[PDB]
Write a protein that binds this DNA or RNA. Structure first.
Ligand SMILES: [Mg+2]
Ligand SMILES: [Mg+2]
Ligand SMILES: [Mg+2]
Length: 135
RNA sequence: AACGCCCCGCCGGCGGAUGCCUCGGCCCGGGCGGCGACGAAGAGCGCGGCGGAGCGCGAGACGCGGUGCGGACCCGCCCGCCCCGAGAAGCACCGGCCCUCGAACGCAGCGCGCCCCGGCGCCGCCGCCUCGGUGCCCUGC
């Protein structure tokens, strides 16, 4: 149950916020769970999805694995190579089938200096959280 | 007869009710209470690579600069970016640019002056400079 009176629980307001979010909020809302092996390596659960990493689709009619080749931020959809609509002819450029990030698992992440710094920033902040509860 | 017209059992039109759904309205509470001659509110006309309306902006024009945060895209076609910082989208604050009308300020509204050096509106308060008066006096003549 919510106790913060400054946060709205109105359906109309929540949906309006969802449909008119700015760029960074949209990016954060497009996260996927990390695999068990990646969870052990970095002590985090989810990661914003980015072009260049590998995912596994675990639900829907287009299950599979592939590399992320495009992010459509104003639809909340991604295109992964090899997941296409069935073609009318064998000679036509494939049409990707857009997929929501919340039904895939990240298998391997494309690594940057900025990604490293962001992950390290994340870990050092839930370390305080864990130190402040339990143990 | 037959056709035409009017009434059942299937299939088509025309029209847009109904049902379900809605980033919209309306009411109640809380906060705030901040414009302008340092040129406001409002109006006009312009500004995009391919650009009509709307938003935004002002010849530095569909934006420029600084400081922080952010971290891969940029609705089409293009161009660009890609990196342990090398920087796309976004966000906050600060500094500037700011055409013509408008309280609207050389006159007038699209034309024309004065001036000598650059500048030339009104009203008020304070102060200064230059002056007037058979006002009240005084001196000299
Ligand atoms: Mg236009
Ligand atoms: Mg004028
Ligand atoms: Mg005038």
């Amino acid at each position: 149950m919510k106790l913060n009176s400054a946060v709205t629980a109105s359906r109309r307001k929540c949906r309006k916020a969802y449909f008119t979010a700015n760029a960074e909020t949209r990016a954060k809302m497009m996260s996927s769970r990390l695999s068990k092996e990646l969870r052990a390596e970095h002590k985090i659960k989810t990661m914003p999805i980015r072009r260049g990493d590998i995912v596994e689709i675990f639900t829907g009619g287009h299950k599979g694995t592939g590399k992320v080749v495009e992010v459509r931020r104003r639809d909340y959809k991604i295109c992964v190579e090899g997941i296409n609509q069935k073609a009318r002819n064998p000679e036509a450029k494939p049409v990707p089938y857009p997929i929501h990030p919340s039904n895939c698992i990240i298998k391997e992440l494309y690594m940057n200096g900025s990604r490293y710094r962001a992950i390290k920033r994340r870990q050092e902040r839930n370390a305080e959280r864990l130190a402040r509860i339990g143990k």
